[PDB]
Amino acid sequence: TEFRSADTHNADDYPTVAAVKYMGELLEKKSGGKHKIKVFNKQALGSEKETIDQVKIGALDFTRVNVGPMNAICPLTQVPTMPFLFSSIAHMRKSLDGPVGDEILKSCESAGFIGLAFYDSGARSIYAKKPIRTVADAKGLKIRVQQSDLWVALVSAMGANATPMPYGEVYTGLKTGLIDAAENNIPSFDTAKHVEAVKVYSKTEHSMAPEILVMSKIIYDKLPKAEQDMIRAAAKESVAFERQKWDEQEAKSLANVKAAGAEIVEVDKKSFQAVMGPVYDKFMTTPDMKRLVKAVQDTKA
Ligand SMILES: O=C(O)[C@H]1O[C@@H](O)[C@H](O)[C@@H](O)[C@@H]1O
Numbered sequence: 001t002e003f004r005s006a007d008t009h010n011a012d013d014y015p016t017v018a019a020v021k022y023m024g025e026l027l028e029k030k031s032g033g034k035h036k037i038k039v040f041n042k043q044a045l046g047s048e049k050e051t052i053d054q055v056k057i058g059a060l061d062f063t064r065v066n067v068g069p070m071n072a073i074c075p076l077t078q079v080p081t082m083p084f085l086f087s088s089i090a091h092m093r094k095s096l097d098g099p100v101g102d103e104i105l106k107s108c109e110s111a112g113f114i115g116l117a118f119y120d121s122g123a124r125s126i127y128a129k130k131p132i133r134t135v136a137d138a139k140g141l142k143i144r145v146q147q148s149d150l151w152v153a154l155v156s157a158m159g160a161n162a163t164p165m166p167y168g169e170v171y172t173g174l175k176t177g178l179i180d181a182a183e184n185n186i187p188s189f190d191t192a193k194h195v196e197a198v199k200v201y202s203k204t205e206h207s208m209a210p211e212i213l214v215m216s217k218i219i220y221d222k223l224p225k226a227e228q229d230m231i232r233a234a235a236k237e238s239v240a241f242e243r244q245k246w247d248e249q250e251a252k253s254l255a256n257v258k259a260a261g262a263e264i265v266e267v268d269k270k271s272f273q274a275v276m277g278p279v280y281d282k283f284m285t286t287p288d289m290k291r292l293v294k295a296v297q298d299t300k301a
Pocket of ligand 1: 008048064065066121146166167183184185188211
């Protein structure tokens, strides 16, 4: 069959878009030409939030979204959203590739989603019209976050005025002054044109919230077991491809924003990490959550 998958990013060569297309090619091979995937980027099938609900009801086969908007519906996705959980990108990758990531993916089935893969999204940092070098600078900042209570709390802990909005509204919000800041990785800041509106990128690196690729359980459950396995394998094998493309995009977008006049500011990251204890207290509240946070931070370099 020809499955459909959604992506919010406009660029046809964005790493997450390229990665699901690659998955589709692997799936065609593994299935002897039976199954294919068509990727609808440019949020053609809806915002992230909208596509998650379409997948839930079986109207959309796959969606590639950030863990952020999955935080309430698949609560263990909150774990890798947590601020300063991972010590580095390498640590994130090892954690998500291993039993921690796999447990989180499997946990989404109770909510109607087959978790298939985590894709790299770098580290997220604040961008604004002024530098944010300490949490004191963040106090009162009118900043957009993704649509989850955890995300609101995470940035609120910095003293900022966190405002949940869908991604597609961010560019205009920054241009018109409806919001004064947002936060994201460099490729997003670049490709969504946020850099056109605000130039100061303060490297708070306050989350490494990865992407998650989910399939509709309703659709998955109707396929033969052997074909379910093909889909799982194609997804898993696409992660290495996504990561290589992601590394390349990080470099390209950094060059782009620097050339466009972005001011990249180094910060006292401990200023920001020092305020996050209560976010763990308020959100990492179940035994599974506590065990997974510990498992991540027990992971050896
Ligand atoms: O901030 C956001 O909403 C966006 O952040 C980007 O990093 C994710 O790639 C994209 O999936 C999210 O929709």
